[PDB]
């Protein structure tokens, strides 16, 4: 309302409001316990992975590879690229890994 | 040629532009729906080229 109701009374209401929670209370209005879990999926290397083995690193061969969820197919060699210690994966022109 | 290669990294209204990510996240009935937008976009780019 337009009136400045300082102190709980007419037309000024408390924000919080707790409902009644009873074991034999009505169906539909019953309490329910909710966990919602949110992700961030990207093609870049990630932090939390699933449980899988770590195999071995095979070079100079056509293999399927999976680094931190970054999957692909190709030949892995050793290159003299000066990655900074935060920089994880490189990417050339027109966005290819 | 650079435009044709660079056009391969757009989504065309899908969840991602990477096809293996689409196959490794969704069930096949929704995966085909996600793939068809990429198929139409890449056909259109090839025909213009």
């Amino acid at each position: 309302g337009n009136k400045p109701c300082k102190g709980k009374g007419p037309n000024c209401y408390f924000p919080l409001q707790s409902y009644g929670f009873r074991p034999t209370y009505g169906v539909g209005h019953q309490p329910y316990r909710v966990v919602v879990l949110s992700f961030e999926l990207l093609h870049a290397p990630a932090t939390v992975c699933g449980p899988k083995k770590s195999t071995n690193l095979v070079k100079n061969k056509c293999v399927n590879f999976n680094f931190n969820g970054l999957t692909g197919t190709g030949v892995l060699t050793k290159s003299n690229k000066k990655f900074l210690p935060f920089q994880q994966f490189g990417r050339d022109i027109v966005d290819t890994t | 040629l650079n435009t044709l290669v660079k056009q391969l990294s757009s989504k065309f209204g899908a969840i991602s532009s990477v096809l293996n990510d689409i196959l490794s996240r969704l069930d096949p009935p929704e995966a085909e729906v996600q793939i068809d937008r990429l198929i139409t976009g890449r056909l259109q780019s090839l025909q213009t080229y």
Binding site: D92, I93, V94, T96 | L1, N2, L4, V5, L8
Partner: peptide, 28 residues
């Protein structure tokens, strides 16, 4: 080649060609 043909060859400047690996080839 003639000297003039060498200026014509050198003047026309013909990682970029490493990104045709998505199904495209250039024929000689």
């Amino acid at each position: 080649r003639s000297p003039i043909e060498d200026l014509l060859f050198n003047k026309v400047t013909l990682l970029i060609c490493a990104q045709k690996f998505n199904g495209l080839t250039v024929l000689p």
